[PDB]
Paper text:
Organisms accordingly deploy silencing factors, such as the E3 ubiquitin ligase silencing factor of the integrated stress response (SIFI), to terminate stress response signalling and ensure cellular homeostasis. After restoration of mitochondrial import, the E3 ligase SIFI marks HRI and its activator DELE1 for proteasomal degradation to terminate eIF2α phosphorylation and restart protein synthesis. SIFI forms an antiparallel dimer of heterotrimers that comprises two copies each of the E3 ligase UBR4, the E3 ligase KCMF1 and calmodulin. UBE2A was captured by the C-terminal region of each UBR4 subunit that became ordered in its presence. Together, these proteins assemble into an approximately 1.3 MDa structure that is built around an open twisted-ring scaffold (292 Å × 229 Å) and two arms that extend to the side and span about 356 Å.
Purification of SIFI through its subunit KCMF1 led to a complementary map of the N-terminal half of UBR4 at an overall resolution of 3.4 Å. SIFI’s scaffold is primarily composed of α-helical armadillo repeats of UBR4 and relies on antiparallel dimer interfaces at its N- and C-terminal regions with buried surface areas of around 2,160 Å2 and 4,212 Å2, respectively. The N-terminal dimer interface is mediated by a domain-swapped helix from one protomer that bundles with three helices of the second, as well as two Arg residues that interlock the dimer through polar interactions.
Numbering used by the authors:
A (entry chain B): 28 to 161, 182 to 205, 228 to 354, 366 to 433, 441 to 451, 465 to 499, 504 to 546
B (entry chain A): 274 to 354, 366 to 433, 440 to 451, 465 to 499, 503 to 554, 640 to 890, 903 to 1092
The structure:
């Protein structure tokens, strides 16, 4: 009987999914639920490919599913999301699906559409063609959709827009299944346990101790090594961004809020370090491919910063001073990165052959600064504008130690700005950036 | 401020005279309110620092308290009862007051200095104030009013413990209160399960409290469930009143309907669907038989409304949504379930006649409850649910009684198709013991109804007709349950009633067509001529009766040899109705003619699928008796059958099963066969006679 299932699958693989065969696969999954959840690695590939293809096809027909059959679709999708989160929590070698692809499958079950590419879809079909598996039927099917309608009612609250609305329900109840599995949390665990993200988070956390900002991709050799580590880092940043687009960080509670800030400041630092490495590359010295990779990395770095910022801002469990302090920390990181990229010369790099803003400060502009440098800089300017507007009103009609590098850290406006001023001669950094930009534009 | 202490909510215009004085001061109050609102509207309080945040919050609540006070004073005036001018001032005050609250609120929420937990506590304070005021206003009775004839202590009413005083202003406050309630409950939900106890949250924006504590505070301050239901009932009833007025303060029933619908949605989602244990526990405890009765009343009111309208439809759907939630939710105790069923009149263990016709939600709810009960038993392999077996036996009897009386019922007094469908579904879930007992009871009922032929011959048969549709469907399907019936029930009873003007009955082709003609032209308001065995394919007469049904018929429980007679004799039912109504210069109405056509059709199919019994084969083997009108009809039918061997076989094998000696069978069949001209001459002589 496993045969007929791969069957509707391939029939639909050819020319879209036959809604008619759909009520068959839903049944299949809802049943083999326990099998998919607990199976032997002998048929891991089979089960994994089954789940991926099922998710993709159910998302393809998300907008068009019989309103009566809609509930069974939601049950089968809860089973599929269970398998996906289980795998993302416990990475398995016998699994035939990549963590990026699994995160993307959860994203699609929980979002408007699936994104698994067709090349990868045919790869899944081949891993399924592996066949490495371990009337009356109509009656059973309807009786089951029955035990479903009965037991639980859709509470379907919240003909060219009815598709919109069905997608809406699909999405919503799938999101609910996730929250149901606390996958959002499981998924924060996953985001904090990425292979390249572990080290980036370690360095950024070492830095919240006011140990100067200390980007590491800096020695000629270290920048060569990170250009080597550029492509794989893109893979991790992309995966993290795809994951944190879902309601992964919905309940921003101090506890979780800390980790949410951690991951955000983590890509911030990873991106600033990649920018510093590109700065060393242009100052000290497939290359175009690596350049595009690093550009994408810095872009998604700023994007994740912005996402976590807006999350803390519109949250009912976080925001105000908490959001203000997240902004403060982001601005600190960006300004320190700008300073490091500005003050690096062929001379210094060659002599080195772990920059410290305080090191350069005690020792005491052009070059290194580039297009990625423009990006970090514009963002820093936004954040500084915000903090300074705060300081205005605060001193309404003209109206402590530097703000600690922590999200919940309590500080006055003047204080956040004093920490941002004690980390870099600010007037200097700003004017230097102005001059350099003007010159380069000329 | 005094109220914030110990949530001692109070209002000073409790006395009508007090309210009158308050009204007198309405004008300047309006000016103050407008002025304050405008001042807040213009760029002000940019930094909501704790101190400023508190000050801003105070003003928000200041207007808030004033607005509810005005609403209360008006309610007091009404119960006691420039007039419009004062009403205008009061309405303006309430509206602008709520607007001040909302401004200060968006400010807190969006601000960068205190925008989140402070917003949440501001919302608690607001709800608390709104809920307290609403509760107080509803609790204001002219009696208590004159008794007083000043602080309206909510605690006193509760501690001490019509519902008049609810009006447009009450609706406004209720709506805003609902909004605040929804938010705090959504907050509860986002939190994972059972995060935690603790004390009622404190009435302070700065005070940091758990969402549960905030909700706990609201519940402790005022009974959330009671207030919600009170508002719901009052709103719906008031809307109905306005509707009646229109058939014969805002007179828009939709307004109250909207509020009522919102209340249903809030409870169902924020509470009923809430997985929070605390919430569920509170709900279960809050739930009372009184609430069930109120809910039942509203259901019946909606079901018996007879007017879909527009907003009414939305409210109706929401009502069902709430009803089904209750039926599925374990919060509703079995005691509460039975209470609601009795209040609807569909109690599955009540006495008297079974309600043949059941109202659209009264039926849907009953079906959901009974089916969930049968599933519970089936899940653990428990014995047939006694409740559903009693529905079945009280139905079979309202019916033996109805057919014994042979009185044509009205559409409101006739079994609805969807009801028949859910009953067949329940019959299936029953074990062999239950379904066999139902079959035996049906046989006994038909046999007893045949005891008086004269009465049956002069009665209209719509009800022996429905009993035999039932028995017929039982015959064809007595083991496996059909796919259509499932779909049928799910689509009709177990699915949102929005506002699909169709059930889903396999109607009779011949009967329904004739009805339509001699019937309302707009649409067929009701299926009175339908079928529940599907427009099936014409299988060979043989093998129609479900093998297991055949086995039961020939078991000791069923005396088929004699049910054959009661069935043959029954054909004369409603034969002299035309002879009677014409003698009395009356014409068989369309319903009556249609019914008579329906009955012959149903009994004709039954006589055909049921195997000829031994006594009757023996008769076909003598022919001396009268073989009356219908008797000869049946005889010719079976002779034609016997001419064909398949039927010979079918009938002879049934005789072997019947228990008749096999050789006896052979001989009888032979004689009846009258092979060759023998049969020709036999036909001839029977028609000759």
């Amino acid at each position: 009987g496993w045969e007929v299932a791969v069957r509707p699958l391939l029939s639909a693989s050819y020319s879209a999914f036959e809604m008619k065969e759909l009520p068959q696969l839903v049944a299949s999954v809802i049943e083999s639920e326990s099998e998919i959840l607990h199976h032997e690695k002998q048929y891991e590939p089979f089960y994994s490919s089954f789940v991926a293809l099922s998710t993709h096809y159910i998302t393809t027909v998300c907008s068009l599913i019989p309103r009566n059959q809609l509930q069974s679709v939601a049950a089968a999708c809860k089973v599929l999301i269970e398998f996906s989160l289980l795998r993302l929590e416990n990475p398995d070698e016998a699994c035939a699906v990549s963590q990026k692809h699994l995160i993307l499958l959860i994203k699609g079950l929980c979002t408007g559409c699936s994104r698994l590419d067709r090349t990868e879809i045919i790869t899944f079909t081949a891993m399924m063609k592996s066949a490495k598996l371990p009337p009356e039927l109509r009656q059973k099917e309807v009786q089951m959709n029955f035990l479903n309608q009965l037991t639980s009612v859709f509470n379907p609250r919240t003909d060219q827009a009815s598709a919109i609305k069905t997608k809406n329900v699909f999405i919503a109840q799938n999101v609910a299944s996730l929250q149901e599995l606390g996958g959002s949390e499981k998924l924060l665990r996953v985001c904090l346990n990425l292979p390249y993200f572990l080290r980036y988070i370690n360095r950024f956390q070492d830095a919240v101790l006011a140990n100067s900002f200390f980007i590491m991709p800096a020695t000629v050799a270290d920048a060569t090594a990170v250009r080597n580590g550029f492509h794989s880092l893109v893979i991790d940043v992309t995966m993290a961004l795809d994951t944190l687009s879902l309601p992964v960080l919905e309940p921003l509670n101090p506890s979780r809020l800390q980790d949410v800030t951690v991951l955000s400041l983590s890509c911030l630092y990873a991106g600033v370090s990649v920018a510093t490495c590109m700065a060393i590359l242009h100052v000290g010295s497939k290359e175009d491919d690596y350049e595009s990779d690093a550009a994408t990395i810095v872009q998604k770095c700023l994007e994740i910063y912005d996402m976590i910022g807006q999350a803390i801002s519109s949250s009912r469990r976080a925001g105000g001073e908490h959001y203000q302090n997240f902004q403060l920390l982001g601005a600190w990181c960006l300004l320190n990165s700008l300073f490091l990229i500005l003050n690096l010369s062929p001379t210094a790099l060659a002599d080195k052959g772990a920059l410290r803003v305080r090191d350069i400060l005690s020792r005491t502009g052009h070059q290194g600064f580039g297009v990625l440098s423009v990006i970090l800089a514009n963002h820093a300017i936004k954040l500084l504008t915000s903090l300074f507007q705060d300081l205005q009103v605060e001193a309404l009609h003209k109206g402590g130690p530097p703000a600690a590098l922590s999200i919940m850290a309590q500080s006055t406006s003047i204080q956040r700005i004093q920490r941002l001023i004690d980390s870099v001669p600010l007037m200097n950094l700003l004017l230097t950036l102005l001059s350099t930009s003007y010159r380069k534009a000329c | 401020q005094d109220a914030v202490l110990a949530n001692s909510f109070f209002i000073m215009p409790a006395t009508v005279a007090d309210a009158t004085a308050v009204r007198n001061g309405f004008h300047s109050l309006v000016i103050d309110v407008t002025m304050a609102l405008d001042t807040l509207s213009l760029p002000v309080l940019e930094p909501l620092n704790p101190s400023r945040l508190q000050d801003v919050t105070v003003l928000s609540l200041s207007c808030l308290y004033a607005g509810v006070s005005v609403a209360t004073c008006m309610a007091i005036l009404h119960v006691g009862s420039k007039e419009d001018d004062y009403e205008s001032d009061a309405a303006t005050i309430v509206q602008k007051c709520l607007e001040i609250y909302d401004m200060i609120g968006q400010a807190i929420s969006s601000s960068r200095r205190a925008g989140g937990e402070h917003y949440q506590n501001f919302q608690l304070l607001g709800a608390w104030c709104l809920l307290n005021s609403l509760f107080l206003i509803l609790n204001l009775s002219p009696t208590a009013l004159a008794d007083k004839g000043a602080a309206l202590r909510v605690r006193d009413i509760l501690s001490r413990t019509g519902h008049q005083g609810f009006g447009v202003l009450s609706v406004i406050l209720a709506n805003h209160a609902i909004k605040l309630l929804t938010s705090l409950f959504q907050d509860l939900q986002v939190e994972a399960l059972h995060k935690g106890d603790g004390p009622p949250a404190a009435l302070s924006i700065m005070a940091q409290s758990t969402s549960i504590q905030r909700i706990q505070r609201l519940i402790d301050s005022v009974p959330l469930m009671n207030l919600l239901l009170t508002l719901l009932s009052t709103s719906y009833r008031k809307a109905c009143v306005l509707q009646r007025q229109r058939k014969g303060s805002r007179k828009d029933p939709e307004l109250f309907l909207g509020l009522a619908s919102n209340i249903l949605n809030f409870i169902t989602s924020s509470m009923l669907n809430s997985r929070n244990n605390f919430i569920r526990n509170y709900l279960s405890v809050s739930l009372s038989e009184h609430h069930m009765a109120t809910l039942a009343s509203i259901i019946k009111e909606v079901d018996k409304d007879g007017l879909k309208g527009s907003s009414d439809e939305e409210f109706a759907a929401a009502l069902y949504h709430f009803n089904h939630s209750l039926v599925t939710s374990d919060l509703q105790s079995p005691n509460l379930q039975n209470t609601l069923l009795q209040q609807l009149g569909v109690a599955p263990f009540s006495e008297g006649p079974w309600p043949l016709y059941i109202h659209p939600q009264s039926l849907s709810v009953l079906s959901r409850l009974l089916l969930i009960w049968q599933h519970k038993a089936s899940a653990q392999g428990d014995p047939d649910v006694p409740e559903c077996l009693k529905v079945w036996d009280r139905f079979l009897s309202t019916m033996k009684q109805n057919a014994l009386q042979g009185v044509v019922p009205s559409e409101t007094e006739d079994l609805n198709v969807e009801h028949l469908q859910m009953l067949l579904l329940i019959f299936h879930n029953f074990t062999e013991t239950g379904r066999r007992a139902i079959l035996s009871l049906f046989v006994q009922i038909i046999q007893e109804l045949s005891v008086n032929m004269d009465a049956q011959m002069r009665f209209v048969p719509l009800i022996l007709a429905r009993l035999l549709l039932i028995f017929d469907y039982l015959l064809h399907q007595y083991s496996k349950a059909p796919v259509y019936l499932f779909e049928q029930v799910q689509h009709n009873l177990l699915s949102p009633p929005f506002g699909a003007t169709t059930p889903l009955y396999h109607g009779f082709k011949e009967v329904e067509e004739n009805w339509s003609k001699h019937f309302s032209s707009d649409a067929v308001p009701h299926p009175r001529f339908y079928c529940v065995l599907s427009p099936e394919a014409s299988e060979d007469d043989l093998n129609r009766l479900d093998s297991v049904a055949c086995d039961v018929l020939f078991s000791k429980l069923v005396k088929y040899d004699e049910l054959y007679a009661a069935l043959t004799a029954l054909l004369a039912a409603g034969s002299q109705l035309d002879t009677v109504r014409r003698k009395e210069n009356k014409n068989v109405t369309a319903l009556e003619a249609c019914a008579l056509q329906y009955y012959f059709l149903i009994l004709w199919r039954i006589l055909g699928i049921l195997p000829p019994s031994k006594t009757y084969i023996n008769q076909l083997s003598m022919n001396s008796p009268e073989m009356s009108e219908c008797d000869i009809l049946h005889t010719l039918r079976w002779s034609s059958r016997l001419r064909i061997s398949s039927y010979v076989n079918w009938i002879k094998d049934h005789l072997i099963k019947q228990g008749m000696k096999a050789e006896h069978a052979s001989s009888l069949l032979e004689l009846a066969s009258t092979t060759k001209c023998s049969s020709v001459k036999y036909d001839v002589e029977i028609v000759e006679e």
